[PDB]
A paper describes a structure:
We selected a bifunctional enzyme, diaminohydroxyphosphoribosylaminopyrimi­dine deaminase (EC 3.5.4.26)/5-amino-6-(5-phosphoribosylamino)­uracil reductase (EC 1.1.1.193), called RibD, in this pathway as a potential target in Gram-negative bacteria. In bacteria, the second and third stages of this metabolic process involve zinc-dependent deamination and an NADPH-dependent reduction at the ribosyl group, respectively. RibD is constructed from an N-terminal deaminase domain, which carries a Zn2+ ion, and a C-terminal NADPH-binding reductase domain. The overall structure of AbRibD is an arch-like dimer and most certainly not a uniform globular entity.
Numbering used by the authors:
A (entry chain A), B (entry chain A): 2 to 172, 175 to 357
Write the structure that this text describes.
Amino acid sequence: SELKQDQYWMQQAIELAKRGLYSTKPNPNVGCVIVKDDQLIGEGFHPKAGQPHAEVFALRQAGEQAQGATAYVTLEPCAHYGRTPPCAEALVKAQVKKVVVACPDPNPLVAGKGVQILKNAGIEVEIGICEDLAAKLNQGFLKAMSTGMPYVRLKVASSLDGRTAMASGESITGSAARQDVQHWRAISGAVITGIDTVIADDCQLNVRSLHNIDIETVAQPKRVILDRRGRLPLTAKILENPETVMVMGPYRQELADLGVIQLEIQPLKTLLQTLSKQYQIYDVLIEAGATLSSAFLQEGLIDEMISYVAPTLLGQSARAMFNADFEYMAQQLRFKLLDVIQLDQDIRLRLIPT
Amino acid sequence: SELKQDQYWMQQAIELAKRGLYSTKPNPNVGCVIVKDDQLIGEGFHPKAGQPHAEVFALRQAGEQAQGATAYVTLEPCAHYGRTPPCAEALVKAQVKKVVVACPDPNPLVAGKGVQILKNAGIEVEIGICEDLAAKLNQGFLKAMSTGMPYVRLKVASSLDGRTAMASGESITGSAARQDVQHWRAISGAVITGIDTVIADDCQLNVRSLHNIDIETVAQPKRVILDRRGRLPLTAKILENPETVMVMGPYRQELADLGVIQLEIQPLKTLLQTLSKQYQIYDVLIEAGATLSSAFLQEGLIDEMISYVAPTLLGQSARAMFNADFEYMAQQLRFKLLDVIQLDQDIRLRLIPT
Ligand SMILES: Nc1nc2c(ncn2[C@@H]2O[C@@H](COP(=O)(O)O)[C@@H](O)[C@H]2O)c(=O)[nH]1
Ligand SMILES: Nc1nc2c(ncn2[C@@H]2O[C@@H](COP(=O)(O)O)[C@@H](O)[C@H]2O)c(=O)[nH]1
Ligand SMILES: Nc1nc2c(ncn2[C@@H]2O[C@H](COP(=O)(O)O)[C@@H](O)[C@H]2O)c(=O)[nH]1
Ligand SMILES: Nc1nc2c(ncn2[C@@H]2O[C@H](COP(=O)(O)O)[C@@H](O)[C@H]2O)c(=O)[nH]1
Ligand SMILES: O=C([O-])C(=O)[O-]
Ligand SMILES: O=C([O-])C(=O)[O-]
Ligand SMILES: O=C([O-])C(=O)[O-]
Ligand SMILES: O=C([O-])C(=O)[O-]
Ligand SMILES: C[As](C)(=O)[O-]
Ligand SMILES: C[As](C)(=O)[O-]
Ligand SMILES: [Cl-]
Ligand SMILES: [Cl-]
Ligand SMILES: [Zn+2]
Ligand SMILES: [Zn+2]
């Protein structure tokens, strides 16, 4: 089947795209393979902002044999000049016979323009092959470019009885869960937390450990601290790397002098739009306490909740994970369960609102 | 390997034992295969109290060819007369060459006596083959016979935030979890609940639905209701089948006239010992509210907790699953996680105290 061969090669391209997962932000993960007479002649992936696009690497490998070949690309070749020349033009120049595209461009202001340039040159273009699987490569980018809002993941860690701490915030989950969290942080443009967490935990919320990846190649998440009374202590550990920190609160000259980006107090929905529009942050991880976590949930600002549950009971006086006060069952916040996995002694659920 | 062949056949016997899982109580699940010249000549399992033991069925099949053969039995052949003749004597009579035993007898007053009868006849006896796997056939019976206390499973159903109901007991988990609970009920000699649950839910706590098993062959759990003020309404659904009901509370002639077994108010640990010693109940399922469930937990009376968690948030005013008031993290009740599975939209954890 010609469809199944197209799917076979696009799946190779989707695999290449994953080599950049942690280093591409704000740019999309993109793979590309070039195939001729059923033979692979060029592979490429986008490693990092400012570096060449996937198609460019793949063509450099393919060389002159790219003429008459088929290019499989997980995303629509670009039609504009920025830090690099446009990919649609490179494919034309290489005189490929056919370009197969998984996802069209999510930005409505440019969508279809790359394909159009291919149509004009007489290049065969078919679109939609393994689109579902390719979309999983770019949940944040695709959402942010099509709607102006980032993809938001809420992380929570609790006991079996749904508690996050004793009455006084003494603290559940183990090292396997901690390692898993590294992955979620490393695909995020920002980790959002509240001042309460920073004061209680003195956390860094950064990426320090990943499987099969050198941490120096990681594009680190910005640490976004919601601090409405401007209480962030200057000695906080989260401030050792100040240029990757943003504080939402009353303007403090101490913070500006350190290079910390300061945001005016704004509604959570507006905050998310700001991060996407002004700061190119398309994947957000929330790592916060009950109050801030519940605010995001109740305002309907969560795309996915990642819940770590530890095999322990903390009792009815320990801190509730979700602090809404509901009366009737009809008010419950129901989610669709995607999956559950075991992480040593903990478990992790992934959940999508309904 | 002679060990691996012994293991191969014992595993066939362990499999046969499972055919009686739901109908054997209070008797143990027991399988038996008879093998000669590497050929299976007889299989047997114990189906139900009063019926022949596994070895008897297997020998009836083996017939005269049982002479010189090897018998694999998941539990030590009995050495005493009750409702049936003793199995040790049947094997001798059949003139088997060798008897392979997984689990020795758990009752210390009779342990080794069956083996002794085999030793005396010159019959080869080796013991311990796939013991771990065979023990899983009889968690309750083996515990109760060796210690006088039943194996106790605590079932709980909660939201992700560890809640069981709204402030007023309005009620989470779905049909897949409900079906799973049927299995746990069907291996139990008793389901224990409190009056609060009976009043709120009007539950039956019986077995009505099982995979690949006719419900008429099931030996139903007794429904044990803890009712210290004697409030059980005579119109309660749990009372439609009164002879399988036990109430712990102040004596009521209304209940005796219906045939309900009445227990005097006693401590929970004493209650469990009573059920085992006086009523031959070796596997207990607790299906109760927060108060009674927490009492069992805090008194250290739980062997295993089976926790069903639904993908929903009920909020901080909904009923806590565990009502202890702890202050420090050191007071937490920690469990070892055995496994987690997905049940459609819910999950189930199995947990063992530490
Ligand atoms: N690559 C990767 N994926 C992880 C990790 N931890 C959890 N996951 C998630 O768990 C798997 C679930 O499959 P999915 O349905 O998301 O494709 C992965 O796809 C990924 O989303 C991790 O450490 N590395
Ligand atoms: N046979 C059976 N086992 C179940 C069912 N639901 C849960 N289980 C448990 O889940 C599996 C876990 O394997 P185990 O470690 O207990 O041998 C089974 O062994 C059994 O204990 C059920 O409906 N039928
Ligand atoms: N903890 C915390 N909650 C916030 C913050 N900003 C907004 N919220 C909560 O989000 C909800 C809606 O407020 P808005 O997002 O419209 O400002 C309110 O319940 C508010 O308390 C914040 O910076 N920190
Ligand atoms: N809800 C409930 N709790 C009980 C019952 N029997 C004992 N408990 C609880 O178990 C704990 C120890 O009491 P004991 O088991 O020594 O009578 C106490 O906290 C007590 O309230 C009962 O029948 N129902
Ligand atoms: O990033 C690269 O080096 C590539 O795609 O070859
Ligand atoms: O600092 C606070 O209290 C806040 O952010 O709301
Ligand atoms: O129970 C039976 O009928 C058996 O074991 O053959
Ligand atoms: O009925 C009650 O309140 C009880 O059992 O404790
Ligand atoms: C598919 As592209 C964003 O590398 O032109
Ligand atoms: C192993 As038996 C209890 O059937 O004698
Ligand atoms: Cl916080
Ligand atoms: Cl109860
Ligand atoms: Zn491009
Ligand atoms: Zn017997």
